[PDB]
Paper text:
All three proteins contain an N-terminal [name] interaction domain responsible for subcellular localization and a C-terminal EVH2 domain that polymerizes actin. The [name] domain binds SLiMs with the consensus motif [FWYL]PXΦP, where X is any amino acid and Φ is any hydrophobic residue.
To understand the structural basis for the high-affinity and selective interaction of [name] B with [name], we solved a crystal structure of [name] [name] domain fused to a 36-mer [name] sequence to 1.65 Å resolution. To minimize the influence of the fusion on the domain–peptide interaction, we introduced a long, flexible linker between C-terminus of the [name] [name] domain and the [name] B sequence. Consistent with our truncation studies, our structure showed that only 21 residues of [name] were fully resolved in the electron density (PCARE828–848). PCARE828–848 uses a 14-residue alpha helix-rich extension C-terminal to the LPPPP motif to make additional contacts to an extended region on the [name] domain, explaining its high affinity. Most intriguing is the interaction between Val837 on [name] and the hydrophobic groove in [name], which typically engages large aromatic residues. Specificity arises from a mechanism whereby [name] stabilizes a conformation of the [name] [name] domain that is inaccessible to family members VASP and EVL.
Author numbering: 0 to 112, 133 to 153
Write the structure that this text describes.
């Protein structure tokens, strides 16, 4: 009840977008792959994405998933969404990881309801995070 089960695990390079200089930067400040989970909170029926660098366990994404999140499959292997502070981009090691992770995210959202392109307006202007923390 006060614990979270992993419903999905994917390996990915976690990026964050820099609005002012219009480029993607590695989340946490260092290149490298992360292990990214979608966690379901058994008691509260909420979901969270948690990504940690494989090398040193640095937490580079810890993001509540709100009803209505805009999850953009920009390419077969690069998917984007945002929270109140940052715009994330997951560059998956493989189309298979990406398909699994996107599928799990879309299911969670149903329950709740130069190689890399920039985030579109629907992502940049997503206010779904505003339905939380109030």
């Amino acid at each position: 009840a006060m614990s979270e089960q992993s419903i999905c695990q994917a390996r990915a390079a976690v990026m964050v977008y820099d609005d002012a200089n219009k480029k993607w930067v590695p989340a946490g400040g260092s290149t490298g792959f992360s292990r990214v989970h979608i966690y379901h909170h058994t008691g509260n029926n909420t979901f969270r994405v948690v990504g940690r660098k494989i090398q040193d366990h640095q937490v580079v994404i810890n993001c509540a998933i709100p009803k209505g999140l805009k999850y953009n499959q920009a390419t077969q292997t690069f998917h984007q969404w945002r929270d109140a502070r940052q715009v994330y981009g997951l560059n998956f090691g493989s189309k298979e990881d990406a398909n699994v992770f996107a599928s799990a995210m879309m299911h969670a959202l149903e329950v709740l309801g130069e190689h890399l392109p920039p985030p579109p307006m629907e992502v940049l202007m997503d206010k779904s995070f505003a339905s939380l923390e109030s």
